[PDB]
Write a protein that binds this ligand. Sequence first.
Ligand SMILES: O=S(=O)(O)OC[C@H]1O[C@](O)(COS(=O)(=O)O)[C@@H](OS(=O)(=O)O)[C@@H]1OS(=O)(=O)O
Length: 198
Amino acid sequence: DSKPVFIKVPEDQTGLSGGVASFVCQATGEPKPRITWMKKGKKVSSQRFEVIEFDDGAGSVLRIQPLRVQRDEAIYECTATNSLGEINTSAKLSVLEEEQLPPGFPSIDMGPQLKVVEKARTATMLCAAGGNPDPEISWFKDFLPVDPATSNGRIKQLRSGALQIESSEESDQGKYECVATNSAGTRYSAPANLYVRV
Ligand SMILES: O=S(=O)(O)OC[C@H]1O[C@](O)(COS(=O)(=O)O)[C@@H](OS(=O)(=O)O)[C@@H]1OS(=O)(=O)O
C-alpha cells in the first residue's frame, strides 16, 4: 500500500474567445486513487461540463468549449484521494479577445485533413505552425491526449509536427486535433477524421 503521488499536473493557460482549453491530471498509488475537479472551491457537475476519464479512474481531462470571457476566467483545482491520504494542486485560466492578440501569438499554417486508409498500411496526419517564439506541438484524439511512448514503436511524432501511424487497425479510427503553444498562448486546429476500410 502507498499514498498517492502526481505524475502529471495542470499548468497556467491563456486561450482565445470562441476556442477550446483542456486541463490534464494523473496520479499513482495503491489502491488506485480517484481524481475530482473543482471551480472556485466547488465540485464540478458532470451533467454540465465535459469530463473524460482514463487509466481506470486514476487520470482525468476537463474540457471547456466555446470559451467565453466572463464565465470561464477563474482558478481550477485537481484533487486525488485513496484510503491512505489526499493531495491537491491548482492552475489559472485567462481568455483574450481578438483585438488583444500580440503579434507573436501562435498560428496554424497548414492543418490536418480527412483520410480513408486500408487496413495494415501507414497513415500520416500533418500540422505546421508559426509564431514568435516557435511553438511546441501536441495531439488529442476523441478529447484524450495521445502518448506515443506507449505504442511500442507503432506511433511516433516527427520533428516537423506530424503524427505517423504504422500497421493501421480498427482502434485507430476517430477525431484528431493539433495544438500549438508558446509564451503568449495556445491555439487549436479544426478537427479531422480518420476511417479504416476494407
Ligand atoms: O461565472 S460563474 O462562476 O458565475 O458561472 C456561472 C454559475 O452561475 C451559477 O448559477 C452560480 O452562480 S455563482 O456566481 O454563485 O457561482 C452556476 O450555475 S448552477 O446551475 O450550477 O448553480 C454557474 O456555475 S458554473 O457555470 O458551473 O460556474
